[PDB]
Write an enzyme that holds these catalytic residues in place. Structure first.
Site, PDB file in Angstrom:
ATOM      1  N   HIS A  37       0.910  -1.579   0.117  1.00 41.40           N
ATOM      2  CA  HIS A  37       0.293   0.174  -0.149  1.00 41.40           C
ATOM      3  C   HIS A  37       0.767   1.218   0.086  1.00 41.40           C
ATOM      4  N   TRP A  52      -1.311   3.981   2.194  1.00 41.55           N
ATOM      5  CA  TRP A  52      -1.826   3.963   3.118  1.00 41.55           C
ATOM      6  C   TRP A  52      -1.081   3.392   4.283  1.00 41.55           C
ATOM      7  N   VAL A  93     -14.241   9.097  -7.812  1.00 40.63           N
ATOM      8  CA  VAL A  93     -13.307   9.569  -8.623  1.00 40.63           C
ATOM      9  C   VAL A  93     -14.074   8.625 -10.160  1.00 40.63           C
ATOM     10  N   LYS A 134      -5.049   6.886 -11.050  1.00 38.46           N
ATOM     11  CA  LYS A 134      -3.822   8.231 -10.704  1.00 38.46           C
ATOM     12  C   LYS A 134      -3.332   8.694  -9.906  1.00 38.46           C
ATOM     13  N   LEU A 155      -5.573   9.955  -7.746  1.00 35.95           N
ATOM     14  CA  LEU A 155      -6.297  10.576  -7.309  1.00 35.95           C
ATOM     15  C   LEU A 155      -6.998  10.741  -5.669  1.00 35.95           C
ATOM     16  N   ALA A 156      -7.309   9.246  -5.761  1.00 38.71           N
ATOM     17  CA  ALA A 156      -7.837   9.561  -4.521  1.00 38.71           C
ATOM     18  C   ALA A 156      -6.891  10.090  -2.825  1.00 38.71           C
ATOM     19  N   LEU A 186     -24.255   7.122   6.347  1.00 37.55           N
ATOM     20  CA  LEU A 186     -24.724   7.473   5.384  1.00 37.55           C
ATOM     21  C   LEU A 186     -24.218   6.868   3.463  1.00 37.55           C
TER      22      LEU A 186
HETATM   23  C1  LIG Z   1      -8.029  13.366  10.592  1.00 37.07           C
HETATM   24  C2  LIG Z   1      -9.317  13.902   9.311  1.00 37.07           C
HETATM   25  C3  LIG Z   1      -8.699  12.665   8.002  1.00 37.07           C
HETATM   26  C4  LIG Z   1      -9.704  12.676   7.122  1.00 37.07           C
HETATM   27  C5  LIG Z   1      -9.172  10.984   6.341  1.00 37.07           C
HETATM   28  C6  LIG Z   1      -9.658   9.796   6.323  1.00 37.07           C
HETATM   29  C7  LIG Z   1      -9.783   8.729   6.159  1.00 37.07           C
HETATM   30  C8  LIG Z   1     -10.857   9.362   5.009  1.00 37.07           C
HETATM   31  C9  LIG Z   1     -10.175   7.834   3.482  1.00 37.07           C
HETATM   32  C10 LIG Z   1     -11.339   7.267   2.859  1.00 37.07           C
HETATM   33  C11 LIG Z   1     -12.168   7.417   3.366  1.00 37.07           C
HETATM   34  C12 LIG Z   1     -13.754   7.097   2.450  1.00 37.07           C
HETATM   35  C13 LIG Z   1     -14.896   6.810   2.131  1.00 37.07           C
HETATM   36  C14 LIG Z   1     -15.987   6.040   1.182  1.00 37.07           C
HETATM   37  O1  LIG Z   1     -16.094   7.000   0.907  1.00 37.07           O
HETATM   38  S1  LIG Z   1     -16.052   4.282   0.608  1.00 37.07           S
HETATM   39  C15 LIG Z   1     -16.423   4.290  -1.255  1.00 37.07           C
HETATM   40  C16 LIG Z   1     -15.140   4.953  -2.254  1.00 37.07           C
HETATM   41  N1  LIG Z   1     -15.439   5.164  -3.761  1.00 37.07           N
HETATM   42  C17 LIG Z   1     -16.557   4.412  -3.713  1.00 37.07           C
HETATM   43  O2  LIG Z   1     -16.200   3.456  -4.239  1.00 37.07           O
HETATM   44  C18 LIG Z   1     -16.890   4.944  -5.843  1.00 37.07           C
HETATM   45  C19 LIG Z   1     -16.122   4.263  -6.420  1.00 37.07           C
HETATM   46  N2  LIG Z   1     -14.653   4.374  -6.936  1.00 37.07           N
HETATM   47  C20 LIG Z   1     -13.726   5.294  -6.730  1.00 37.07           C
HETATM   48  O3  LIG Z   1     -14.616   7.108  -6.642  1.00 37.07           O
HETATM   49  C21 LIG Z   1     -12.803   5.140  -6.716  1.00 37.07           C
HETATM   50  O4  LIG Z   1     -12.732   4.093  -7.505  1.00 37.07           O
HETATM   51  C22 LIG Z   1     -12.303   5.383  -5.877  1.00 37.07           C
HETATM   52  C23 LIG Z   1     -12.221   6.930  -5.568  1.00 37.07           C
HETATM   53  C24 LIG Z   1     -11.901   4.698  -4.341  1.00 37.07           C
HETATM   54  C25 LIG Z   1     -10.636   4.800  -5.765  1.00 37.07           C
HETATM   55  O5  LIG Z   1     -10.163   6.169  -6.871  1.00 37.07           O
HETATM   56  P1  LIG Z   1      -9.043   5.097  -8.117  1.00 37.07           P
HETATM   57  O6  LIG Z   1      -9.371   3.917  -7.984  1.00 37.07           O
HETATM   58  O7  LIG Z   1      -9.039   5.849  -8.931  1.00 37.07           O
HETATM   59  O8  LIG Z   1      -7.459   4.488  -7.360  1.00 37.07           O
HETATM   60  P2  LIG Z   1      -6.205   5.918  -6.736  1.00 37.07           P
HETATM   61  O9  LIG Z   1      -5.552   5.410  -8.084  1.00 37.07           O
HETATM   62  O10 LIG Z   1      -6.790   6.890  -7.300  1.00 37.07           O
HETATM   63  O11 LIG Z   1      -5.505   5.176  -5.786  1.00 37.07           O
HETATM   64  C26 LIG Z   1      -5.392   4.417  -4.967  1.00 37.07           C
HETATM   65  C27 LIG Z   1      -5.225   4.522  -3.688  1.00 37.07           C
HETATM   66  O12 LIG Z   1      -6.446   4.263  -3.000  1.00 37.07           O
HETATM   67  C28 LIG Z   1      -6.747   3.641  -1.724  1.00 37.07           C
HETATM   68  N3  LIG Z   1      -8.368   3.337  -1.919  1.00 37.07           N
HETATM   69  C29 LIG Z   1      -9.213   2.677  -2.678  1.00 37.07           C
HETATM   70  N4  LIG Z   1     -10.649   3.030  -2.501  1.00 37.07           N
HETATM   71  C30 LIG Z   1     -10.329   3.220  -1.444  1.00 37.07           C
HETATM   72  C31 LIG Z   1     -11.221   3.959  -0.383  1.00 37.07           C
HETATM   73  N5  LIG Z   1     -12.794   3.347  -0.711  1.00 37.07           N
HETATM   74  N6  LIG Z   1     -11.216   4.406   0.604  1.00 37.07           N
HETATM   75  C32 LIG Z   1      -9.839   4.202   0.640  1.00 37.07           C
HETATM   76  N7  LIG Z   1      -9.314   4.903   0.005  1.00 37.07           N
HETATM   77  C33 LIG Z   1      -9.283   3.356  -0.922  1.00 37.07           C
HETATM   78  C34 LIG Z   1      -6.063   2.239  -2.772  1.00 37.07           C
HETATM   79  O13 LIG Z   1      -6.037   2.019  -1.816  1.00 37.07           O
HETATM   80  C35 LIG Z   1      -4.567   2.928  -3.387  1.00 37.07           C
HETATM   81  O14 LIG Z   1      -4.182   3.339  -1.426  1.00 37.07           O
HETATM   82  P3  LIG Z   1      -3.106   2.365  -1.750  1.00 37.07           P
HETATM   83  O15 LIG Z   1      -3.155   0.748  -1.788  1.00 37.07           O
HETATM   84  O16 LIG Z   1      -1.487   2.059  -3.107  1.00 37.07           O
HETATM   85  O17 LIG Z   1      -1.931   2.706  -0.906  1.00 37.07           O
HETATM   86  C1  LIG Z   2     -30.612  -5.870  -4.702  1.00 36.59           C
HETATM   87  C2  LIG Z   2     -30.448  -6.066  -2.932  1.00 36.59           C
HETATM   88  C3  LIG Z   2     -31.664  -7.719  -2.589  1.00 36.59           C
HETATM   89  C4  LIG Z   2     -29.447  -5.357  -2.221  1.00 36.59           C
HETATM   90  C5  LIG Z   2     -28.631  -4.018  -2.650  1.00 36.59           C
HETATM   91  C6  LIG Z   2     -29.491  -2.775  -3.051  1.00 36.59           C
HETATM   92  C7  LIG Z   2     -28.732  -1.796  -3.648  1.00 36.59           C
HETATM   93  C8  LIG Z   2     -28.085  -1.742  -3.612  1.00 36.59           C
HETATM   94  N1  LIG Z   2     -26.857  -0.685  -4.604  1.00 36.59           N
HETATM   95  C9  LIG Z   2     -26.064  -1.051  -4.417  1.00 36.59           C
HETATM   96  C10 LIG Z   2     -24.981  -1.825  -4.022  1.00 36.59           C
HETATM   97  C11 LIG Z   2     -25.654  -2.860  -4.046  1.00 36.59           C
HETATM   98  C12 LIG Z   2     -26.982  -2.945  -3.578  1.00 36.59           C
HETATM   99  C13 LIG Z   2     -27.909  -4.042  -2.969  1.00 36.59           C
HETATM  100  N2  LIG Z   2     -26.778  -5.249  -2.498  1.00 36.59           N
HETATM  101  S1  LIG Z   2     -26.208  -5.924  -1.167  1.00 36.59           S
HETATM  102  O1  LIG Z   2     -25.418  -6.590  -0.807  1.00 36.59           O
HETATM  103  O2  LIG Z   2     -26.926  -5.133  -0.024  1.00 36.59           O
HETATM  104  C14 LIG Z   2     -24.269  -4.350  -1.049  1.00 36.59           C
HETATM  105  C15 LIG Z   2     -23.685  -5.052  -1.569  1.00 36.59           C
HETATM  106  C16 LIG Z   2     -23.163  -3.756  -1.895  1.00 36.59           C
HETATM  107  C17 LIG Z   2     -22.901  -2.497  -1.080  1.00 36.59           C
HETATM  108  C18 LIG Z   2     -21.014  -1.011  -1.253  1.00 36.59           C
HETATM  109  C19 LIG Z   2     -19.967  -0.781  -0.839  1.00 36.59           C
HETATM  110  C20 LIG Z   2     -20.044  -0.149   0.519  1.00 36.59           C
HETATM  111  C21 LIG Z   2     -20.550   1.347   0.508  1.00 36.59           C
HETATM  112  C22 LIG Z   2     -20.219   2.111   1.655  1.00 36.59           C
HETATM  113  C23 LIG Z   2     -21.820   1.871   2.207  1.00 36.59           C
HETATM  114  C24 LIG Z   2     -21.683   3.734   3.231  1.00 36.59           C
HETATM  115  N3  LIG Z   2     -21.116   4.960   2.489  1.00 36.59           N
HETATM  116  C25 LIG Z   2     -20.879   5.793   3.894  1.00 36.59           C
HETATM  117  C26 LIG Z   2     -19.744   4.226   2.653  1.00 36.59           C
HETATM  118  C27 LIG Z   2     -19.663   3.643   0.874  1.00 36.59           C
HETATM  119  C28 LIG Z   2     -23.055  -1.944  -0.218  1.00 36.59           C
HETATM  120  C29 LIG Z   2     -25.052  -3.120  -0.754  1.00 36.59           C
END
Ligand SMILES: CCCCCCCCCCCCCC(=O)SCCNC(=O)CCNC(=O)[C@H](O)C(C)(C)COP(=O)(O)OP(=O)(O)OC[C@H]1O[C@@H](n2cnc3c(N)ncnc32)[C@H](O)[C@@H]1OP(=O)(O)O
Ligand SMILES: CC(C)Cc1ccc2ncccc2c1NS(=O)(=O)c1ccc(CCCCC2CCN(C)CC2)cc1
Length: 411
Positions: A2, A5, A161, A168, A170-171, A411
């Site tokens: 990582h 991270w 992203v 890239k 960006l995260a 949420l």
């Molecule tokens: C004191 C205050 C602190 C505040 C900050 C606290 C921390 C908050 C942390 C964030 C909490 C978020 C809570 C939510 O919203 S969780 C929901 C996250 N959003 C999605 O899944 C939406 C769809 N996916 C995307 O938009 C992209 O794939 C994302 C943006 C997720 C990654 O973009 P991309 O795929 O283009 O990758 P990269 O090349 O830029 O970056 C790769 C690096 O990113 C690490 N990565 C991948 N997924 C996540 C993830 N969910 N949390 C943290 N890190 C993640 C990965 O391990 C790698 O790091 P390393 O393995 O090389 O080390």
């Molecule tokens: C198809 C249903 C029987 C259940 C269901 C309903 C809507 C869903 N929409 C998007 C993805 C999955 C869905 C789903 N299937 S699931 O097993 O209940 C399930 C599978 C996967 C997820 C997503 C990973 C959680 C993302 C976290 C969610 C909370 N948040 C604060 C940060 C991002 C959430 C729910």
């Protein structure tokens, strides 16, 4: 491996986390003056932008980004479609900090490319009960209880992203910039959840769902008869009979929540949440914000017996785009929110949640196994989903706990 991270103040392995016995910070202590005043560097083609999440058009821009690029299931069947009304509610609670809503745009055309959001929360995150028992045995009670006071921290959500810009790096830039802005507000911890495994969760729970419209659900998810129903002569009639619900609530005295309910709802909810190792602490303003009914967003009902609120439940709406199936645009899901039961069994209270959701046209009720949500899984015909939700802290050492010790709904 990582590259990002490994540089952050989080436990690095499961093995490390299984060793932690007391809650407390990970990093060197810092002050606001140590933290850069300037935004984190980003390529010249991009610019930081702070949307105004109370402004309809800025909300709509973030809405589109998430609609098209946010979280999917693992099989390309659903994408969350949080509504504009929901985003305003979730991102602008009492005392929110606008600066914690962080976007990246392309400078040339102002196209929105990325987002991350922080919101303030007051969280109990002191050493968990089972480790305080151990601490007491070892004569280390004070050290275990040092960080018991509820902490004014950041919850991070909505990291996104654009799909064109994936992989890239960006995260990490978005995370660094959020961290900088939160640290500049004298806040040093965050809580976050994700469906993916990162270093290193303090708890993890499965998702559970309860079909409300099985004909729609079975058609999308299969898109014909599920295997265990294949034995019946008339599988669809069996499915419909299995998931059928009352057409009206059963609990006498059920009604929608009223502003004058706020203080009683606060008291019964806080008394209940205080039983959990990790959970929020809400003011009256926060109870009002997160629980009073908001059309299309959050739905909250109380059981009132002689002017006394004895029980309540809430659910919120997140539709998902049905990105694979041609027949339907959206799946309308109701997620279990906060609740508290002092007069009736929890399964009886949440039956009414299912009945109201169904009557309002939701297709499915979803939740994670936090709180006492496992107590009504079987009785109310929830099934495990394919997802897991992992709970994390930033800059906070914390022992592993069970998801039934978590009281924070994200949420
Ligand atoms: C004191 C205050 C602190 C505040 C900050 C606290 C921390 C908050 C942390 C964030 C909490 C978020 C809570 C939510 O919203 S969780 C929901 C996250 N959003 C999605 O899944 C939406 C769809 N996916 C995307 O938009 C992209 O794939 C994302 C943006 C997720 C990654 O973009 P991309 O795929 O283009 O990758 P990269 O090349 O830029 O970056 C790769 C690096 O990113 C690490 N990565 C991948 N997924 C996540 C993830 N969910 N949390 C943290 N890190 C993640 C990965 O391990 C790698 O790091 P390393 O393995 O090389 O080390
Ligand atoms: C198809 C249903 C029987 C259940 C269901 C309903 C809507 C869903 N929409 C998007 C993805 C999955 C869905 C789903 N299937 S699931 O097993 O209940 C399930 C599978 C996967 C997820 C997503 C990973 C959680 C993302 C976290 C969610 C909370 N948040 C604060 C940060 C991002 C959430 C729910």
């Amino acid at each position: 491996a990582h590259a990002f991270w490994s540089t952050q103040p989080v436990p690095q392995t499961e093995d490390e986390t299984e060793k932690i016995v007391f809650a407390g910070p990970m990093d060197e202590p810092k002050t606001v003056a140590d933290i850069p005043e300037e935004p984190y560097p980003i390529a010249s083609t991009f610019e930081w932008w702070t949307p105004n999440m109370e402004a309809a058009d800025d909300i709509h821009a973030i809405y589109e980004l998430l609609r098209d690029n946010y979280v999917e299931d693992d099989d390309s069947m659903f994408r969350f479609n949080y509504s504009e009304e929901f985003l305003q509610w979730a991102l602008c609670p009492p005392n929110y900090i606008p600066d914690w809503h962080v976007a990246v745009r392309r400078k040339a055309d102002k196209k929105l490319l990325a987002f991350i959001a922080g919101v303030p929360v007051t969280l109990r995150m002191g050493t968990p009960k089972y480790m305080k028992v151990k601490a007491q045995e070892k004569g280390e009670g004070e050290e275990a209880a040092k960080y018991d006071e509820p902490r004014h921290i950041c919850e991070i959500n909505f990291l996104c992203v654009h799909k064109q810009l994936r992989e890239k790096r960006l995260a990490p830039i978005l995370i660094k910039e959020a961290t900088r802005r939160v640290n500049r507000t004298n806040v040093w911890q965050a809580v976050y959840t994700a469906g993916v495994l990162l270093p290193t969760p303090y708890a993890s729970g499965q998702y559970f769902h309860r079909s409300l419209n099985p004909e729609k659900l079975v058609e999308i998810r299969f898109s014909g008869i599920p295997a265990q129903y294949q034995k019946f002569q008339n599988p669809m009639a069996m499915l419909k009979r299995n998931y059928q619900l009352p057409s009206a609530p059963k609990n006498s005295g059920l009604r929608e929540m009223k502003p004058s309910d706020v203080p009683q709802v606060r008291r019964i909810l806080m008394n209940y949440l205080d039983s959990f190792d990790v959970g929020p602490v809400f003011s009256d303003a926060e109870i009002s914000h997160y629980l009073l009914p908001r059309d299309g967003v959050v739905f909250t009902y109380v059981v009132e017996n002689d002017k006394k609120v004895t029980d309540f439940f809430s659910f919120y709406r997140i539709p998902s785009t049905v990105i694979g199936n041609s027949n339907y645009n959206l799946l309308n899901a109701a997620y279990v929110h906060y609740y508290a039961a002092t007069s009736i069994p929890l399964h009886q209270l949440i039956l009414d949640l299912l009945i109201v959701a169904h009557s309002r046209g939701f297709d499915v009720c979803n939740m994670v196994e936090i709180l006492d949500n496992r107590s009504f899984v079987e009785q109310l015909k929830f099934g495990a989903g394919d997802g897991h939700l992992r709970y994390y802290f930033y800059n906070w050492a914390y022992p592993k706990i069970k998801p039934s010790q978590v009281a924070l709904v994200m949420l």
